Design a protein around this nucleic acid. Structure first.
Lengths: 368, 366, 50
RNA sequence: CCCCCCCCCCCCCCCCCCCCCCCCCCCCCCCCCCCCCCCCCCCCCCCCCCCCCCCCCCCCCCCCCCCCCC
């Protein structure tokens, strides 16, 4: 009879963050560089120059990558994106001087250094090669900005953790992923380039959603490059950002961990349900919320259900997925139990002849 | 059976029928800062955190001034007018910042003291102070407002209780901010915010609108994403009883089956159904200090309240809750059951939905 | 009871690659040959020659 | 080919109504106690991970329909 005792608090919590008819105008005075579409070849060369030679400083490496995105998305379409991200920042169209590029916020001295150092390396190598450097090894190759951005994509995935953790992962994966790019540009300093991208994503927060819009846009096109198709695939592995707990939650259900049946865990069912139902309420943007550093994010926290979190983590530990996850374990008791069951499950081999739906003449032969 | 009155619904329905609008705060004036001066107010916010000041009286008003720049040059007047207060706004100017209601002397003191501290430290640092440690850092107003957010959560209790909670949580939450601005006097800043929320009641809903607005944006700061998360923990304001009520149902406390508690079912139902009738605004009603609030009182059902509190005590949630216990007898009983429940470990093979070959192996678990 | 524990991630993953109102402008300077319909007989002969 | 018989219809009787009776009519204000609400705790996040990779032209038979009677 006592059923009307129900509050859908989490839904209301979200509903309040939609009612805002008023809009925030942050980054009031701020200015960032944008490159017009017309200068795509010039920025492509500059990107290649960063990869081609071993440079003294890789400070603005990330800003150069953003400048290629700028040419790719729109001469001035970029301002629209930035304004719509919530930041009231103004754009500055990068010009040419003598031929070089004058990028706003980027020291003229740095641009010249990158160019000078690359030309020096080209001269040294062309003497050795006996005047023979193929197109694919030159800073002029059209895929060089994509390669640069792929290092950014790897640091984009690990934006959820330390500036440090990300560099490990970036370096490790870059070796396997950018295997062939590294063959042609062995001078690309992955750690310094990846550091420039972390610094950029942390300082210019609006560039996080600009990167997302490049990804979204690239994901749509009919014909992509081999390098481009890699970029999006790195970007996809970044979807479950900061929500690792919810995805391991479905894994606990799939494993049919008997600890999910514990009375104390059963008590948290309605809160858990509320969180997964908010994901459905928010739809596709739900996943990249943490990646955008959106204030809205965090409503997808499993803080309200500590016993469930304990079981989910235990199950992950038992299956051997948990790895380097620092996620706090509230109920150590439940964790150990879930872990034990999952370890026993892991080794055990069983067959559901119920699921298969075979004839009892095929089910006859299967016993054999 | 026709002996039924839906009084609580009618009680609410009457507070909608008001075609007439109240014009309180007739002569009142408050400071607003135009969007154009966001950098100047950002610096002033940083100055408050950066040095150990003599007085933190207007610290909260400065925070509201950043909200003002963030929401709108003049959009703020609209919000205040729509909160029910007929208060007028005053656009803050520049001299060689002149904030309305804020003593020019105070502004100069804060600036002077901060410059003195910058000079002392730059000599020690050997001319090296990184951006993140300067009062110029863009996240300094957000940090200031986060102290306000913590006092906003404990607006339901004493001016005192709030300061404890604010200080405790600020240490864990604003951990890194405190590393860069160790001179921020959390207790004085938090006191300025309590005083402000109590005096300028319209600033409560202005703070809510900043929160709502911030919660909507595509890209937020690390500091901004913290602010909203403090603001969220503030949703179940003054309704702690209703949320502990659902906890009593989730615990399946057998005392909710008591005949005297069963008698109050219709009143209890009426309250939870009013929450659904009011929707999302229902939660922050107590936080807004709305006169409408209080219709969500469980005064009509004392025996139910007793069981809910007992259950909370038994599970060990009750903590420092001063909420009066009408039926001491029922409370003790609910507490006993909840304590026995708390320790006991059981498995619902019904809920799991396993094969009876997986349910077979589960029994083997010694 | 344990229902509701579900994320349709792959669908959302695709849904995000539709939301792109913005269009990519790659191959900015590039030029490729096109033959007008009128020269179909001439290109046919050249194909045969290969 | 179809069709092919027989065949006007009607026709009696018969006015209706007629009794009785106003309705209503008692009693009766309602109201009346208690009662502010709140009060605990709680940043979130943290792992891993490019995908792709085989083979493969299809087609291939046969066949006008119609044909009585009335």
């Amino acid at each position: 009879s006592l059923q009307g005792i129900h509050l859908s608090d989490l839904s209301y919590k979200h509903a309040i963050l939609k009612e805002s008819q008023y809009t925030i105008k942050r980054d009031v005075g701020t200015t960032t560089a944008v490159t017009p579409s017309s200068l795509q070849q010039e920025i492509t060369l500059l990107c290649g120059e960063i990869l081609y030679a071993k440079h003294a400083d890789y400070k603005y490496a990330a800003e150069i990558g953003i400048q290629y995105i700028s040419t790719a998305l729109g001469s001035e379409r970029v301002q629209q994106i930035l304004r719509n991200s919530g930041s009231e920042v103004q754009v500055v169209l990068t010009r040419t001087y003598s031929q070089m590029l004058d990028i706003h916020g980027v020291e003229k001295s740095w641009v010249e250094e990158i160019d000078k150092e690359a030309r020096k390396t080209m001269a040294t190598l062309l003497k050795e090669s006996s005047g023979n450097i193929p197109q694919n090894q030159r800073p002029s190759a059209p895929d060089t900005p994509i390669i640069l951005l792929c290092v950014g994509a790897l640091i984009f995935t690990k934006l959820a953790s330390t500036i440090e953790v990300g560099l490990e992962t970036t370096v490790r994966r870059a070796n396997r992923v950018l295997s062939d790019a590294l063959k042609r540009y062995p001078r690309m300093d992955i750690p310094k380039i990846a550091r420039s991208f972390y610094d950029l994503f942390e300082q210019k927060v609006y560039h996080r959603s600009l990167f997302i819009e490049y990804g979204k846009a690239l994901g749509s096109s009919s014909t992509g490059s081999k390098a481009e198709s890699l970029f999006v695939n790195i970007f996809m592995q970044a979807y479950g950002a900061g929500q690792t707990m919810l995805r391991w939650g479905v894994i606990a259900r799939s494993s049919n961990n008997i600890m999910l049946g514990h009375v104390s865990v059963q008590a948290e069912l309605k809160q858990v349900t509320e969180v997964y139902d908010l994901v459905r309420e928010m739809g596709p943007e739900s996943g990249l919320l943490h990646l955008r550093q959106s204030p809205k994010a965090g409503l997808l926290s499993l803080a309200n259900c500590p016993n469930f979190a304990s079981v989910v983590l235990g199950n992950a530990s038992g299956l051997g997925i948990i790895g380097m996850y620092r996620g706090r374990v509230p109920n150590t008791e439940l964790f150990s139990a879930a872990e034990s069951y999952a370890k026993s499950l892991k080794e055990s081999n069983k067959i559901n002849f119920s699921s298969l739906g075979l004839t009892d003449e095929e089910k006859e032969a299967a016993e054999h």
